[PDB]
Amino acid sequence: QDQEQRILKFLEELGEGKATTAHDLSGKLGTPKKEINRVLYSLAKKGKLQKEAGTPPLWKIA
Amino acid sequence: SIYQDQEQRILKFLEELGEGKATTAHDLSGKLGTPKKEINRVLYSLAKKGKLQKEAGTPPLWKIA
DNA sequence: CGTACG
DNA sequence: CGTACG
């Protein structure tokens, strides 16, 4: 769970209104974008995050 | 070169398969014992270079063109 | 579930 | 280039 909480903690420390990219999260958290994404898409299905469609997608606390 | 070996192993498996016949990167991966990802890398490469023909689908089919 | 992508 | 994929 280390990552899930870690990602939310970051998105919480960066304004509930401001989004962000997985790549962004990766470079800031020192973690593989692939793992970042699985974590992100999961939180999104759980409805914990808000995925903003597009290329690339944008993530922000729900 | 390992990369070229795998390229050749792919070309040989499809030449033996039969020019008009095709198969998935999955079968290719299981038969040559190489992760499906790498197979796809060589496959799209060889396709780019016209040596192989991709038959769109889910999943795609590959054959010697 | 297609994914090839580095 | 969107890729999360076991």
Curated annotation (Swiss-Prot), chain B:
This is Double-stranded RNA-specific adenosine deaminase. Residues 1-65 are annotated as: Interaction with Z-DNA. The third dsRNA-binding domain (DRBM 3) contains an additional N-terminal alpha-helix that is part of a bi-partite nuclear localization signal, together with the sequence immediately C-terminal to DRBM 3. The presence of DRBM 3 is important to bring together the N-terminal and the C-terminal part of the bi-partite nuclear localization signal for import mediated by TNPO1. RNA binding interferes with nuclear import. Residues 1-65 form the Z-binding domain. Catalyzes the hydrolytic deamination of adenosine to inosine in double-stranded RNA (dsRNA) referred to as A-to-I RNA editing. Homodimer. Homodimerization is essential for its catalytic activity. Isoform 5 can form heterodimers with ADARB1/ADAR2. Isoform 1 interacts with ILF2/NF45 and ILF3/NF90. Binding to ILF3/NF90 up-regulates ILF3-mediated gene expression. Isoform 1 and isoform 5 (via DRBM 3 domain) interact with TNPO1. Isoform 5 (via DRBM domains) interacts with XPO5. Isoform 1 and isoform 5 can interact with EIF2AK2/PKR and UPF1. Induction: Isoform 1 is induced by interferon alpha. Isoform 5 is constitutively expressed. Sumoylation reduces RNA-editing activity. It is linked to Dyschromatosis symmetrica hereditaria: An autosomal dominant pigmentary genodermatosis characterized by a mixture of hyperpigmented and hypopigmented macules distributed on the face and the dorsal parts of the hands and feet, that appear in infancy or early childhood. Aicardi-Goutieres syndrome 6: A form of Aicardi-Goutieres syndrome, a genetically heterogeneous disease characterized by cerebral atrophy, leukoencephalopathy, intracranial calcifications, chronic cerebrospinal fluid (CSF) lymphocytosis, increased CSF alpha-interferon, and negative serologic investigations for common prenatal infection. Clinical features as thrombocytopenia, hepatosplenomegaly and elevated hepatic transaminases along with intermittent fever may erroneously suggest an infective process. Ubiquitously expressed, highest levels were found in brain and lung. Isoform 5 is expressed at higher levels in astrocytomas as compared to normal brain tissue and expression increases strikingly with the severity of the tumor, being higher in the most aggressive tumors.
